[PDB]
Amino acid sequence: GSHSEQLKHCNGILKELLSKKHAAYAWPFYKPVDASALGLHDYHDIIKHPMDLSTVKRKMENRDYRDAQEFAADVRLMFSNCYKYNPPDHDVVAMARKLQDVFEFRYAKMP
Numbered sequence: 001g002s003h004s005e006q007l008k009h010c011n012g013i014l015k016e017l018l019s020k021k022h023a024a025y026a027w028p029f030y031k032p033v034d035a036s037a038l039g040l041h042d043y044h045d046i047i048k049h050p051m052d053l054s055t056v057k058r059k060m061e062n063r064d065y066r067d068a069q070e071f072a073a074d075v076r077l078m079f080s081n082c083y084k085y086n087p088p089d090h091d092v093v094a095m096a097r098k099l100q101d102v103f104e105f106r107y108a109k110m111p
């Protein structure tokens with residue numbers, strides 16, 4: 001209903017995205033993409049605004065999100081970056097779709 005009640009609900013969503021239940025498809029999103037280590041050609045030229053769950057967690061922990069909409073935008077940016085950069089048949093795209101299914105359903109249940 002209110003900003004704080006909506007933010008509490010978003011903290012609940014983040015907790016689920018970082019739970020053991022979803023870890024089999026969430027782990028590539030736990031930390032920022034390390035383009036050098038992975039040999040991700042032109043990653044930082046194609047992706048202007050990198051995002052990952054550790055960044056979303058740091059922002060939630062410090063109360064940096066003013067509303068639920070800011071939180072949604074960051075999570076969605078993380079999935080959108082993954083779809084934009086990677087080939088459609090890469091395993092990480094399938095993991096991203098799986099985690100996003102979890103996010104979208106819980107975010108839609110926000111009162």
Ligand SMILES: COc1cc(=O)n(C)cc1-c1cc(NS(C)(=O)=O)ccc1Oc1ccccc1
Nearest residue numbers: 028029031032033034038081082085086091092
């Ligand atoms: C191309 O890999 C990615 C592309 C991408 O858009 N995202 C968000 C994440 C990855 C990714 C990142 C790391 N390690 S990391 C966080 O950079 O330290 C490890 C595995 C990763 O995915 C893989 C999944 C299955 C097979 C191969 C890779």
